A paper describes a structure:
In order to elucidate the molecular details of the interaction between [name] and [name], the complex structure of [name] and the unphosphorylated Hpt domain of [name] (residues 1–135) has been solved to 1.40 Å using Seleno single-wavelength anomalous dispersion (SAD) for phasing. [name] has the typical (α/β)5 topology seen for E. coli CheY and other structurally characterized RRs. Although crystallized in the presence of Mn2+, there was no additional density in the [name] divalent cation binding site. CheA3P1 forms a four-helix bundle (αA–αD) with an additional C-terminal helix (αE). The site of phosphorylation, His51 in CheA3P1, is located on αB, in close proximity to the active site of the RR with the phosphoacceptor Asp56 on [name] being 7.5Å from His51 on CheA3P1. The interface between CheA3P1 and [name] is dominated by hydrophobic interactions with only one hydrogen bond and no salt bridges formed between the two proteins. The buried surface area of the interface is small (530 Å2), indicative of a weak interaction, consistent with the transient nature of the complexes. In this region, helices αA and αB of CheA3P1 form a hydrophobic pocket comprising Ile11, Leu14, and Tyr15 on αA, and Asn56, Val59, and Leu60 on αB. This pocket is situated adjacent to α1 on [name] and in ideal position to accommodate Met13 on the N-terminal region of this helix.
Two-component pathways comprise sensor histidine kinases (HPK) and response regulators (RRs). Once phosphorylated, the HPK transfers the phosphoryl group to an aspartate residue within the receiver domain of the cognate RR. Neither [name] nor CheA4 is capable of autophosphorylation; instead, CheA4 phosphorylates [name] on H51 of the P1 (Hpt) domain. Once phosphorylated, [name]-P serves as a specific phosphodonor for the chemotaxis RRs, CheY1, [name], and CheB2.
Residue numbers in the entry:
A (entry chain B): 0 to 112, 119 to 134
B (entry chain A): 8 to 136
The structure:
């Protein structure tokens, strides 16, 4: 309800920290788990059933039987938003997200060239849907 | 911000260690089949890390390395001795950029690495004519 509980799953420690730091600044979301791989994500998720939203790297290899994504989709009611390393427009990522059963996709934020404005907007849209 | 700069330096050193290990293994006569994946992942990680912090000059050097390695992985270009050589030079150049930027908490001046960029662009053009 409020705040919404977020799990961040990305093999890049820098991206996990960057996204976590950003979520600290949103009053409506907090981070409750972070994971670098599918099994760790399963371990943290299965133990933390209050997760409302999972942010998942679309570049992270799926487990061989897709146990993490399957568990998230079929054994929880968490929303799943894929994170893409490139612009979503012109990529196959929006279609790949739907295929995997994800509820949305958004580009990973960066300190490059505001900062997480699009990310925050997407997270909020997903939870209000 | 102390924590993210510490992580940039630590994660960056691990990625460059992996980049150098794969290249030195290739130079010693090990097969590309075992090393092109690890090499790509190391460079890709280093690139993404620099992007998180908005270090566009650092990012651009890693990006061109990734393009060259991608030609081997995807476009059937052999991992020849020249590629290995240029990427070893790149790894040393990236290591110096990492040590400097981590300490300045800012992007590098591109001047020192313009030669590397020319070499990468030349090899990319020649082996993908
Ligand atoms: Na081979």
């Amino acid at each position: 309800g409020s705040p919404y509980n977020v799990m961040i799953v990305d093999d890049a420690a820098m991206m996990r920290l960057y996204i976590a730091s950003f979520i600290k600044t949103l009053p409506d979301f907090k981070v409750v788990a972070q994971a670098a791989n599918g099994q760790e994500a399963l371990d943290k998720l299965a133990a933390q059933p209050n997760v409302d939203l999972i942010l998942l790297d679309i570049e992270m290899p799926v487990m061989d039987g897709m146990e993490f994504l399957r568990h998230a989709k079929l054994k929880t009611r968490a929303k799943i938003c894929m994170l893409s390393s490139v612009a979503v427009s012109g990529s196959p990522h929006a279609a790949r997200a739907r295929e995997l059963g994800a509820d949305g996709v958004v580009a990973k934020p960066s300190g490059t060239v505001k900062t997480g404005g699009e990310l925050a907007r997407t997270m909020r849209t997903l939870m209000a849907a | 911000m102390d924590e993210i700069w510490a992580l940039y330096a630590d994660d960056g050193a691990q990625a460059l260690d992996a980049m150098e290990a794969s290249l030195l293994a290739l130079q010693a006569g090990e097969d590309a089949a075992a090393h092109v994946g690890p090499l790509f992942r190391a460079v890709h990680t280093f690139k993404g890390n620099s992007r998180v912090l908005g270090l566009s000059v650092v990012e651009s050097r890693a990006h061109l390395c990734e393009d060259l390695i991608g030609l081997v992985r995807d476009a059937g270009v052999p991992m020849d001795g020249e590629i290995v050589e240029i990427l070893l030079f790149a790894s040393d150049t990236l290591r110096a950029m990492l040590e400097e930027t981590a300490a300045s908490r800012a992007d590098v001046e591109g001047t020192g690495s313009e030669a590397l960029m020319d070499q990468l662009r030349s090899k990319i053009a020649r082996c993908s004519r």
